[PDB]
Amino acid sequence: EPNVFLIFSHGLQGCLEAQGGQVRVTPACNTSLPAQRWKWVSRNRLFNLGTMQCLGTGWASLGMYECDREALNLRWHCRTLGDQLSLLLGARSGQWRIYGSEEDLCALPYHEVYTIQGNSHGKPCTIPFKYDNQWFHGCTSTGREDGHLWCATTQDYGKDERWGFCPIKSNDCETFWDKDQLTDSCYQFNFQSTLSWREAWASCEQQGADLLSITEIHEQTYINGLLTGYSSTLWIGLNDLDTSGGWQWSDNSPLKYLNWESDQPDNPSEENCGVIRTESSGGWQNRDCSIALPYVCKKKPNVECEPSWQPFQGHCYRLQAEKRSWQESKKACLRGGGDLVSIHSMAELEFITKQIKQEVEELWIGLNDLKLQMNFEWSDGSLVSFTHWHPFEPNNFRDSLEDCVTIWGPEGRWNDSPCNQSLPSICKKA
């Protein structure tokens, strides 16, 4: 019902129809009628709800045939379909569009829907498929008692007995999820499935979810945690993929907590997607995004300033041209009754970079990991709600221990560097 649509011709002023094995175009289009209702399916086949059959011709013997029929041509490219109909039917501006909205017929293609459990290793729903000589164009609950929506991963479940569960967008977390009662976070460890990162990213999105994000040390300890006793290597949605940026979370979460393996990450150019390993007791490694590994999903239900200080929104900001270590830079802020600058918004980053930093190369900012290594916090106890690393940053967490963060160049993105280094700094108080 969501991605089912009606084909329409302006040149012929009528929608496509199917009757038995013959195709007619009728000017009076009613969405109520299923014989006029179509949807895209696998193998570039076009599926009809009313007839529960596919459109095809012969290698101009056009009509409607069973999808299983291999000897005919049942394949259609949406981008040419409009042009083809005009040829085989004569719709002699004269273009073919979706009935409701003037959208191309490629507006709602068939998305591979990835399974979750079952003897099928996450393999996508084969649509259509045949159980007990009945054609299905989606997931059905018939053949179960628990009522859970399931589908097959082959042309014939009677012959192959290959099945899987269906993804369900929801705001509860039951049967398919474990729940952390401290944070209302629901996690899903798909040990058996084997999908790419891009494929896995999809399978999570399909469930009103996304790939894992470990934003706090508590999350890692909890997960460490649920992995206990098991053997696997799982995708986590830690990517290097933003060409113009460093590491980030697939859910645009702030990268404040790290748990890389000792000699990791190596090959940040070829291996752009991160994984969690049980063997390292929760440690992170980066691998090739093309490889097929299990994955983990995560979802959550439901001013007048001082004289030398320029203002932005709630707070006042000032530049210290004097060069110092990170720590001695923070002290000079205290002497001013403020702390090292803290950034919580992109707007705040632009101002600080455009108005305050100006044409100075590098600057210390409030971010560090001195309290606990690998866990970054702002100096003024502010929440880390924003992360804007430069490409392949951060990288100095295992080499320096006392790892501190700087703004670098015009763009305003960040490098991490030992607090050894002497640079200018920016202060912020209200």
CSV table of C-alpha atoms in Angstrom, one decimal, residues 239-403:
chain,number,residue,atom,x,y,z
A,239,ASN,CA,32.6,5.4,9.3
A,240,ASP,CA,35.4,7.4,7.7
A,241,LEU,CA,33.2,8.0,4.7
A,242,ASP,CA,32.5,11.8,4.8
A,243,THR,CA,35.2,12.7,2.3
A,244,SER,CA,35.7,16.2,3.8
A,245,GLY,CA,35.8,14.9,7.4
A,246,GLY,CA,37.3,12.6,10.0
A,247,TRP,CA,35.6,9.7,11.8
A,248,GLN,CA,31.9,10.1,12.6
A,249,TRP,CA,28.9,8.1,13.6
A,250,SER,CA,26.4,6.9,11.0
A,251,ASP,CA,23.7,8.5,13.2
A,252,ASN,CA,25.5,11.8,13.2
A,253,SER,CA,26.3,11.2,16.9
A,254,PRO,CA,29.2,13.1,18.4
A,255,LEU,CA,32.5,11.1,18.4
A,256,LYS,CA,33.5,11.6,22.1
A,257,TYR,CA,34.4,8.1,23.2
A,258,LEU,CA,37.0,5.8,21.6
A,259,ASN,CA,37.8,2.2,22.1
A,260,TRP,CA,40.2,1.3,19.2
A,261,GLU,CA,42.4,-1.8,19.4
A,262,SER,CA,46.0,-1.1,20.3
A,263,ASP,CA,47.5,-1.0,16.8
A,264,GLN,CA,44.3,0.5,15.3
A,265,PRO,CA,43.0,2.0,13.1
A,266,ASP,CA,45.4,1.1,10.3
A,267,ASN,CA,44.4,1.6,6.6
A,268,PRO,CA,42.0,4.5,7.1
A,269,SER,CA,42.0,4.8,3.3
A,270,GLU,CA,41.0,1.3,2.2
A,271,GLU,CA,39.1,0.3,5.3
A,272,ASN,CA,36.5,3.1,6.1
A,273,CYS,CA,33.9,1.3,8.3
A,274,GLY,CA,34.4,0.3,11.9
A,275,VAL,CA,33.5,-2.9,13.7
A,276,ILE,CA,33.2,-4.2,17.3
A,277,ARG,CA,35.0,-7.4,18.3
A,278,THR,CA,34.1,-9.7,21.1
A,279,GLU,CA,37.6,-11.0,21.4
A,280,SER,CA,39.1,-7.6,22.4
A,281,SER,CA,36.3,-7.4,25.0
A,282,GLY,CA,34.6,-4.6,23.1
A,283,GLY,CA,37.5,-3.3,21.1
A,284,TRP,CA,37.1,-1.5,17.8
A,285,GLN,CA,38.7,-2.3,14.5
A,286,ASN,CA,38.3,-0.9,11.0
A,287,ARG,CA,37.6,-3.0,7.9
A,288,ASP,CA,36.5,-2.9,4.3
A,289,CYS,CA,32.9,-1.7,3.9
A,290,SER,CA,32.2,-4.3,1.2
A,291,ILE,CA,32.8,-7.4,3.5
A,292,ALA,CA,29.8,-9.2,5.0
A,293,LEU,CA,29.7,-9.3,8.8
A,294,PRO,CA,26.9,-9.3,11.4
A,295,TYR,CA,25.7,-5.9,12.7
A,296,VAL,CA,24.2,-4.1,15.7
A,297,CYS,CA,21.3,-1.7,15.5
A,298,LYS,CA,20.4,1.0,18.1
A,299,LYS,CA,17.1,2.9,18.5
A,300,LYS,CA,15.4,5.1,21.1
A,301,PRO,CA,11.6,5.2,21.4
A,302,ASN,CA,9.4,8.4,21.3
A,303,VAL,CA,24.0,40.3,26.2
A,304,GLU,CA,26.6,42.9,27.1
A,305,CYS,CA,30.2,41.5,27.1
A,306,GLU,CA,33.5,42.6,28.5
A,307,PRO,CA,35.6,45.2,26.6
A,308,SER,CA,37.9,42.8,24.7
A,309,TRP,CA,35.3,40.1,24.4
A,310,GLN,CA,33.0,39.7,21.4
A,311,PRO,CA,29.5,38.2,22.0
A,312,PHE,CA,27.7,35.3,20.5
A,313,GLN,CA,24.2,34.2,21.6
A,314,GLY,CA,24.2,33.5,25.3
A,315,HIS,CA,28.0,33.7,25.9
A,316,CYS,CA,31.0,36.0,25.5
A,317,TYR,CA,34.2,35.0,23.6
A,318,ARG,CA,37.8,36.3,23.6
A,319,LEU,CA,41.1,35.4,21.8
A,320,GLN,CA,44.4,34.9,23.6
A,321,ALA,CA,47.1,35.6,21.1
A,322,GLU,CA,49.6,34.6,23.7
A,323,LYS,CA,50.9,31.1,23.0
A,324,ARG,CA,50.8,28.4,25.7
A,325,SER,CA,50.3,24.7,26.4
A,326,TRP,CA,46.7,23.6,26.7
A,327,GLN,CA,46.8,23.7,30.5
A,328,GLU,CA,48.5,27.1,30.8
A,329,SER,CA,46.0,28.3,28.2
A,330,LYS,CA,43.1,27.3,30.5
A,331,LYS,CA,44.7,29.1,33.5
A,332,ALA,CA,44.9,32.3,31.5
A,333,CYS,CA,41.1,31.9,31.0
A,334,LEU,CA,40.5,31.5,34.7
A,335,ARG,CA,42.4,34.7,35.4
A,336,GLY,CA,39.7,36.2,33.1
A,337,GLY,CA,36.8,34.6,35.0
A,338,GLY,CA,36.1,32.2,32.1
A,339,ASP,CA,37.2,28.8,30.8
A,340,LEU,CA,38.5,27.4,27.5
A,341,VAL,CA,35.9,27.7,24.7
A,342,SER,CA,33.2,25.0,24.4
A,343,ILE,CA,31.4,24.4,21.1
A,344,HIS,CA,27.9,22.9,21.1
A,345,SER,CA,26.6,24.2,17.7
A,346,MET,CA,27.8,24.6,14.1
A,347,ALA,CA,26.8,28.3,14.4
A,348,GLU,CA,29.1,28.6,17.4
A,349,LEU,CA,31.9,27.0,15.4
A,350,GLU,CA,31.5,29.4,12.4
A,351,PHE,CA,31.5,32.5,14.6
A,352,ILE,CA,34.5,31.4,16.6
A,353,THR,CA,36.3,30.5,13.4
A,354,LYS,CA,35.2,33.5,11.3
A,355,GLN,CA,35.0,36.4,13.9
A,356,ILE,CA,37.3,35.4,16.7
A,357,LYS,CA,40.0,33.1,15.3
A,358,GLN,CA,40.4,35.1,12.1
A,359,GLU,CA,43.7,34.6,10.3
A,360,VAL,CA,45.5,32.6,13.1
A,361,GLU,CA,46.5,29.1,12.1
A,362,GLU,CA,45.8,26.9,15.2
A,363,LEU,CA,44.0,27.4,18.6
A,364,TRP,CA,43.4,25.4,21.8
A,365,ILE,CA,39.7,24.6,22.5
A,366,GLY,CA,38.1,23.2,25.6
A,367,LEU,CA,38.1,19.6,24.5
A,368,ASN,CA,40.5,17.0,26.1
A,369,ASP,CA,40.8,13.5,27.6
A,370,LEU,CA,42.9,14.2,30.7
A,371,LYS,CA,40.4,12.8,33.3
A,372,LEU,CA,40.0,9.5,31.4
A,373,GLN,CA,42.0,8.5,28.4
A,374,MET,CA,39.9,7.9,25.2
A,375,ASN,CA,36.9,9.7,26.8
A,376,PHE,CA,36.8,13.3,25.7
A,377,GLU,CA,35.1,15.9,27.8
A,378,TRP,CA,34.8,19.7,27.7
A,379,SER,CA,36.8,21.6,30.3
A,380,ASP,CA,33.8,23.5,31.7
A,381,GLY,CA,31.8,20.3,32.2
A,382,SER,CA,29.6,21.0,29.2
A,383,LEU,CA,27.9,18.2,27.3
A,384,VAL,CA,29.7,17.0,24.2
A,385,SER,CA,26.9,17.4,21.8
A,386,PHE,CA,29.0,18.3,18.8
A,387,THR,CA,32.0,16.9,17.1
A,388,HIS,CA,33.7,18.4,14.0
A,389,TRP,CA,37.0,16.5,13.4
A,390,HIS,CA,39.2,17.1,10.4
A,391,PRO,CA,39.8,14.2,8.0
A,392,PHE,CA,41.3,11.1,9.7
A,393,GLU,CA,41.1,12.9,13.0
A,394,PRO,CA,41.3,12.2,15.9
A,395,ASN,CA,44.6,10.1,15.8
A,396,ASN,CA,46.7,11.1,18.7
A,397,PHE,CA,44.8,9.2,21.5
A,398,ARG,CA,47.2,6.3,21.8
A,399,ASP,CA,50.5,8.2,21.2
A,400,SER,CA,50.1,11.1,23.8
A,401,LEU,CA,47.9,10.0,26.7
A,402,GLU,CA,47.3,13.7,27.5
A,403,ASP,CA,45.3,14.2,24.3
